[PDB]
């Protein structure tokens, strides 16, 4: 529901499709890659699970 | 391609300062017909 | 100083819109000489 904010302080809600863009920005990949490949990425995650 | 995009305007910085020069240029043309 | 540099051209984001402005300005002079 809240990314990493709940472990640091007050819990702040954030959309998951934006939290994953933040993670991609964390790993050094620009965020538009997610917004252009969201469906494929979701399929990969479900297949991996 | 992006899901959830919204509609809004994007203000761009170069256009207003160049619009100052554009108004200046229009004024210069208008004054240039005066003589 | 740098070893292995190569030769190529570099594009600049201000030249094209100021070139459109220069073309507009030249067109404005051309129209202004008509009367
Ligand atoms: C934000 O602005 C966008 C650009 O004006 C706008 O897109 C426009 O949406 C309308 C209706 O969805 C389109 O109208 C056309 O609709 C169909 C094609 O789906 C045609 O058969 C019609 O004849 C009509 O031409 C516009 O073409 C479209 N504009 C562009 C440039 O694609 C968005 O809808 C705006 N945001 C929101 C939330 O509405
Ligand atoms: C990319 O562009 C560079 C600039 O035009 C170019 O540098 C030029 O290289 C030539 C040959 O190396 C020089 O020609 C001169 O060569 C000797 C000096 O080594 C002089 O005695 C000659 O009389 C002659 O003038 C150019 O002077 C030099 N240009 C500049 C501005 O320094 C690069 O060579 C280009 N890249 C590649 C891969 O060729
Ligand atoms: C959010 O969910 C509502 C329904 O719960 C839906 O109508 C809306 O389009 C969704 N927004 C986006 C950006 O998907
Ligand atoms: C108009 O041009 C004349 C010289 O041609 C100059 O003296 C005057 O100050 C100019 N006025 C404006 C408003 O630019
Ligand atoms: C790479 O090596 C080749 C020979 O192995 C040499 O001719 C070339 O100049 C080298 N390139 C650079 C950028 O040092
Ligand atoms: C030229 O200037 C006149 C001003 O009298 C204007 O009516 C006309 O539209 C202009 N033409 C162009 C091509 O800018």
Say if CB B19 and CB B11 are below 8 A apart: no
**Residue A3 backbone phi and psi in degrees, to 5:** 70, -135
Resolution, given in Å to one decimal, reads 3.5
Experimental method: cryo-EM
CA distances from residue B15 to A11, A22, B19, C16 in whole angstroms, order as listed = 41, 31, 6, 14
CA B24, CA C25: separation in Å to the nearest integer?
A: 12
B22, two tokens:
């554009």
Say if CB A24 and CB A31 are below 8 A apart: yes
Chain C interface includes B23 (CB < 8 A): no
Say if CB C23 and CB B20 are below 8 A apart: no
- Chains contacting C (3+ CB pairs below 8 angstroms): B
For the CA atoms of chain C, what is the radius of gyration? 18
**Residue C9 backbone phi and psi in degrees, to 5:** -95, 155
Total Cβ atoms within 10 A of residue C15: 10
Output helix, strand, coil percentages for chain B, rounded to the nearest 5: 55, 0, 45
Asked if A17 and B1 come within 8 Å (Cβ–Cβ), the reply is: no
Say if CB A41 and CB A20 are below 8 A apart: yes
CA C34, CA A29: separation in Å to the nearest integer?
A: 56
Report whether residue B31 contacts ligand 4, using a CB cutoff of 6 Å: yes
Say if CB A38 and CB A21 are below 8 A apart: no
Which residue blocks in chain A are alpha helix, DSSP H? Answer: 5-8, 16-26, 32-48
Say if CB A30 and CB A21 are below 8 A apart: no
CA A44, CA B24: separation in Å to the nearest integer?
A: 57
Total Cβ atoms within 10 A of residue A34: 20
Asked if C25 and B25 come within 8 Å (Cβ–Cβ), the reply is: yes
């Amino acid at each position: 529901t809240s990314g990493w904010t709940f472990g640091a302080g007050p819990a702040l809600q954030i959309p998951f499709p934006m939290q994953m863009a933040y993670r991609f920005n964390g790993i050094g990949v620009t965020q538009n890659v997610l917004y252009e490949n969201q469906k494929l990425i979701a399929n990969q995650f479900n297949s991996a699970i | 391609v992006v899901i959830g995009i919204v509609n809004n305007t994007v203000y761009d910085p170069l256009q207003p300062e160049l619009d100052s020069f554009k108004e200046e240029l229009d004024k210069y043309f208008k004054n240039h017909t005066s003589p």
